């Protein structure tokens, strides 16, 4: 059948496991909420603290679909079951589908409310294929969907930055600020067609990924620990005179142990610290822009993003670099909190010395070198599952160092509105009719997967639930689980999130 | 057609009777209620009386049907006229259907209520094919469905018990309540994929069972009364000194009648006493569980589970272990409360005396013994159908001591929920749309029956309504009846409900 | 070939999964 009072589709979910992909498969309830009016604005964000950054952004009427984390598409067993059991994995496709849609009707006598349902409303719903727009997705953000199904998933609204506030502010003078201004693109998701949806009506996405593996693998040495010790080595030392204290210049055979090697350690910036107060986007890396005239108010600051994790690789000195999350919005300065850990992985710690002819000195940076060999971040289920690296003429490596992902064209986000509905007055306008919608997101997504054999003979290393530890209201319950009141309680630091890359070996 | 205002499927019902199979088929009014908003939580269920067994639980938004009663599936007429008519039947199948399905959308005013009914709206239905989850039903529990038709169903709340609350209280120390705390499993329902339907839409669900025959048929006589007591026999008796009071030794020839059997009698539990105060699960045998350490408080208890009746067979001596049960939720301490009977069938009564040299001395246990013989628990019109035979490496026999009977895969039961509908806040959340569900469920199940025949002469036994009474306001109307006041008069005592198992006869 | 001075066979392990 067809029409009113025919569900679209049913639920979905449960994932799969085969030794040649995994099949994850996830469904939600989500609602958009009418932001913004129907109209744009700016915004012109900041808090103030006036000397703080005050992007001015834009806002739209538009709410997304974010679908990038592993922990949405992950049960806490599902990882751990592909963790503890594959080398490595990408998620090979993607399959998203709105369907069962309502659309409520918000009325307001005074205090309460009433929804009398409604009939014969839309729902636009527009995809990028193209990756036109400045598609909102940012690799850690919130939300995306909730990690637990049966959680209502209330969207976010669409919004972008279309220039950097400062310059452009702009100061007196200038045509060096009034260009940059002037050409300050605008873009809008009406344009390119999209389909509108009554509630009968649903709709299907797909998406493929052209994607690197992300690989759960450890390496018990460090690259340049692999020859045999027991081996003499044909090679020599020579050694400058010390000018002070003593020991003359000699020349030596290199021990059979500790012999020299190539695979310099990957990059890092460690020189740097975060500077000043919060909320004033502290990098301790600011990127920035600085055009040749321009003007800028106190900034620094103020301009430009913070690079953050430097890091990447290169074991840190202290918490400033360590990364930190809250996994969750309620989360206070101190709560919430989960700081990243080091794997104990030998890649993947990477100090580097130099010094001094006499003492080694750890040394700020180490920039790209031709042998360098670093282990992308181990992530977690916590962790955004892919970014998008932007287009450019020219680029490096491009390894995050947020683990996550880079690929030429992400997922396209999924973009929905509530289609205005006006209503007449004498003014006229502006006045439109108070909607919501709720329906039901299936992203069902397979993972190219590959399984992993290796000759160790010791039991190695998996992911146990005795990491886990018991927590929420009365202590009862241990870590993945509701409390009696139930919420879900959150896993504390870093190992309750079991991460990819502690796990299995590899040979180098 | 198809859509709203089409209804899906009709009522049915009326059962069948052929001499192969006896086609039962029912249709009831539910209602789905939104329990437990839609969180899950836990509830750590118990009474204070804090000493109780505070068993932690978990409840879920579902709900679900439970089929599993005879006095479901068949009238007093057709019961009584299998009983009768029958030696044996086992339920060969099982086909249920949900239709007609209806979403009121309850509003409050303040007092009152208003059902705007509703459209776009929607039920999540679940079924078990696989009995993952931890599958509500238990034999007696409560409702099944109401015995009577037109009596609308009230749907109960599914939970499951995680873990034995005690051992992982847990207290101080302790590592050995850690686990086992760590390691409580969570399930949901959301996972694998289900139905959801509007109005229009419905749902069918069918169920195969290998099962056993519950057999209708009595034994005149005990199996160690078979032999034809004219016959002299071959055989000797020697009894050792009495030493006390007097006549020593003798060997004699065994009488030609009261022969000497093999076919020990069934095994029981006599021993034990039912343990303190009620609603602290006094059992008389409790099985718990005692790890090698962990910790526990008062109890026994407490923890485990009373074993109930023991019994099996095995004539009891008081009422304490002759089950019993209310036969409604209004029951009170003694109201309602039909207590079970002996049949008075021969086989099926079962004591064992063993001693002295001089007395016989009924003996308690009686465990498990080559030769035994026992007849299945004779059940009657209310007892359930079957229960599932947990999962396990070894195990004994099977007869489980409630008559009923053993599956390896019970019928699944089918879950269903309200499928949350949220509506937007500030905050935001958490809330959502107050709605019911409303339908109807055909329940027909097809029994593998048989008939009898047999060479005796005489005319055996029947269930009359002359076992039944009268009852209910003034005395009118006699006991499956209404009332004036319309109330179905329950049966009282055991022979009103008419037992299998007391008719007929059988040769052994 | 066969006799001695040729192996009967090799050795073997490793396991599959």
Known sequence: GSGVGISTGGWVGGSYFTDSYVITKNTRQFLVKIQNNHQ?????ISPSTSQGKSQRCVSTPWS????????????????????????????????????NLQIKQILSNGADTTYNNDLTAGVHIFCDGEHAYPNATHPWD???????????????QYGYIPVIHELAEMEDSNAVEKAICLQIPFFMLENSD?????????????????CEWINNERAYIPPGL??????????????????????????????????????MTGPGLLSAQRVGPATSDTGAWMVAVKPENASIDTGMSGIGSGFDPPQGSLAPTNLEYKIQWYQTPQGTNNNGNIISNQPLSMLRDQALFRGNQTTYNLCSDV??????????????????????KPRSDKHTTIDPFDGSLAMDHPPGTIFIKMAKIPVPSNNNADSYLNIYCTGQV?????????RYATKNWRPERRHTTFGLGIG?????????????????????????????????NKVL
Chains 1, 2 share one sequence.
């Not at 949806?197 to 493929?208: D, Q, V, Y």
Request: aromatic residues 18%.
């Open 40 to 44: 744009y604005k700016t915004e012109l």
């Open 64 to 99: 997304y679909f974010n679908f990038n984390q592993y922990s949405s598409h992950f049960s806490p067993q599902d990882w751990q079951r592909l963790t503890n059991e594959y080398k490595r994995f990408r998620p090979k496709g993607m399959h998203v589908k709105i369907y």
């Open 142 to 156: 919130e939300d995306v969907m909730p990690e637990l199904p049966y959680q209502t998933w209330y969207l976010f």
């Open 194 to 210: 999209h389909e509108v949806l009554r509630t009968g009506e649903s709709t299907e996405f797909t998406f493929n990924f052209d």
């Open 226 to 263: 692999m020859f045999n010790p027991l081996v003499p080595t044909r090679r020599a030392q020579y050694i400058r005179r010390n000018n002070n204290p003593q020991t003359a210049e000699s020349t030596s055979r290199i021990a059979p142990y500790a012999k020299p090697t190539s695979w």
């Open 367 to 388: 920039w790209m070198f031709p042998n360098q060999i670093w282990d992308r971040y181990p992530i977690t289920r916590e962790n955004p599952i892919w970014c998008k």
């Open 442 to 450: 299936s992203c069902e997504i397979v993972w190219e997967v590959e």
């Open 472 to 504: 929420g209201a009365d202590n009862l319950n241990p870590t993945y689980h509701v409390d009696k009141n139930g919420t879900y309680i959150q896993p504390t630091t870093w190992d309750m999130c079991f991460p990819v890359k502690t796990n299995i």
